């Protein structure tokens, strides 16, 4: 039996998360092993399986929740050999998936659905990353509601916010506590592009040119990058990226679509910190990351 | 041959239609019956499609979430002609759906499932949403819900972004007390209805719907409301009409444990305001056609 | 005639029937499940009804209700070592009711799982029962947690703003010990992650509590603050004078860390919390019924 074997096992839906680094013009290669679980010179044929991904979306999220659906990766963003040759004697070969991630919209949950048509499926959730992207701890980020023109004393918080890749040193967030799984046409309006500068200051500007959420940065946001060695595991390095910011924005889409509502102005203030666990015994900058 | 409602259907195939509650709740909804030149005198037969609605409820919500299900509108609350004649040449005709909405329980998500059984040679799942000048989705960001801890309301308050005000009659609506989930078990949910009546003198009447008042609703002070209108800066013909209600009350959540089992009620102090916005396109003389939903 | 099962309460929206069994001396307790012969005529046959465990009906329910993509919400088939019941039940000619004696051995049962005993009548000697076995003691059930404040550690000190929920479930461990999930940890989260936040609460005679984390390595960095206490009080209902309301209030304060909020896999910065306040359990007792189990109004 000929199948695929990713470094980590798939989730409850059969989707495997793969982490690819965004580098120089975002050209990066992922190596997916193909296993024969051999006295034959086998030419294995691989193809994009659009249909398995559609069936999974229906089965998991249903036709009634398309905002939660995985999106098939665009043909212009990837390339892989149609045929993989495993000579007689070998039982393992690698499928080199070459990605071109430049200008990828991380609004979508990109999946590359692969299948062995001639000797088994692989639903690869392609997650680009840089030194500033991932799941930030947002417990010190306070979101105050404007009540009678002034921010209220009572603050709302969440445990984490995702920083999505834009390029090699820029990421984006969804403003305040905006639901990261809300209607895609509506959530793209709350993107905040955050660029990491050499002097330790950040650039924070809304993605929406018309700035319908009326994003307004307060003061000069900053970031600090520090590293601690683990006590228990002495070769493990914990790398922290703390971002400190303050801004105002408005939720003008909470009523659902179509409906024009009274915007709810919010004051977002505090910090968020990203952790990256690195196994400094592994010299490769990508293989050393412990996801 | 198909149907054409003013707004396109949602993610489930259900089209929301807005019908004004008026004089004893008798209102007619004129629903276009489009053709996509018609050289035939066609007699298009319309029927209630109970089965498409049942299939949708199962497919979207499942048999295990009936509290989320759409309810087929009661036969006593609507009437429409079985046959719609579109003469040769016409290509577009209006189906007259006559509703009798008096004493409609807006606890239910009413749907009128229609189908074309004969085109005289297409479905419409109409979610009937009655409205008055005071119903819709109210902004509830200035509404604070305090939990009673050791007999006194706590300092920490909980808020939500919106609450729905459902039609009762022409000048009365209802809300679900505090932050009670508007999609919870229907038998439980109905116990938390607050009837809000808008008087001319600018004051309100707020009383629980439950005669036995099991949620121990107690109005504090006198609830008032303000109704104002502003003309838009950008679009000069657009009129923004605001209705703000100002209230304070106490109630108890005695259903959070599910059903059957008896729990310690959680008393809450609800205090603040809620505001409803209605966008009206002046230059359109009809009071229902000017609304931009 | 139709042969079926008849539990004291009717089944839920899913079709699972909740049965309450008391945790006693080494947790050995018997549940009596009646088997009924319904029909217009009198049973003139000596019927030998055959009962079996129906693994498949439970699997079908789990998939139909929660789907294959939410296994953390799934019911778990009860372990064969925790129950015993006769394979055959004899209803003699004349009778239409007999009882299936289900003998449970609940010692060391992990209440992390929603245990279901799926039963079926394979032969009526000429109907399914999905029993959700819920062990209970005098301290287990759904506690009101509105006075339980959870403060987030911001810059090494607990924040002024507190988060609360309406209820927390106290699950049976033994006859006088229960467990909770620390702070506001989701009781329906990934089970492998969920089990790490168990707090074993033991009710002592002097009115004090023992609160220790179940995880031997204490990865959640649980730290009890001061001495937690409990008070047990009773009020008689005004309207129904034989009804007794039993309250068990537990007063505690502790610190813990949520180190699993990111999902599984990638290691996150733990969020330290200060949990402080009280929780109260209500139990309604019908004093006219002398039996300690039959008197409880669930």
Keywords:
homotrimer; 291 residues; mainly beta; Immunoglobulin-like; Lipocalin; 2 domains; six-stranded mixed sheet; 2 helices; structural genomics, unknown function; Structural Genomics
Assigned CATH superfamily of the largest domain in chain A: Uncharacterised protein PF14274, DUF4361
Largest interface: A-C, 23 and 20 residues
Per the CATH scheme, the topology name of the largest domain in chain A is Lipocalin
- The tally of strands of chain A reads 21
Return the structural class of chain A: mainly beta
Strand/helix succession of chain A: EEEEHEEEEEEEEEEEHEEEEEE
What is the count of DSSP helices of chain A, taking H or I runs of 4+ residues?
A: 2
Shape field of chain A: globular
CATH architecture of the largest domain in chain A: Beta Barrel
- What value does the Rg of chain A take, in angstroms? 22 Å
Could you state the oligomeric state of the chains shown? Answer: homotrimer
Description:
The structure is a homotrimer. With 291 residues, chain A is mostly beta strands. The first copy, chain A, folds into 2 domains: 1-131, hypothetical protein (bacova_03559) (Immunoglobulin-like, Sandwich); 132-291, Lipocalin (Beta Barrel). The first copy, chain A, is 5% helix and 49% strand. In chain A, the strands form 4 sheets. In chain A, strands 2, 4, 5, 7, 9 and 10 form a 6-stranded mixed sheet that branches. The longest helix of chain A is centred in the N-terminal third of the chain and has 12 residues, at 50-61. The radius of gyration of chain A is 22 Å and the shape is globular. The first copy, chain A, starts with a strand and ends in a 12-residue tail after the last strand. It is classed as structural genomics, unknown function. The entry lists the keywords Joint Center for Structural Genomics, jcsg. It forms a trimeric assembly. Crystal structure of a Multidomain protein including DUF1735 (BACOVA_03322) from Bacteroides ovatus at 2.80 A resolution.
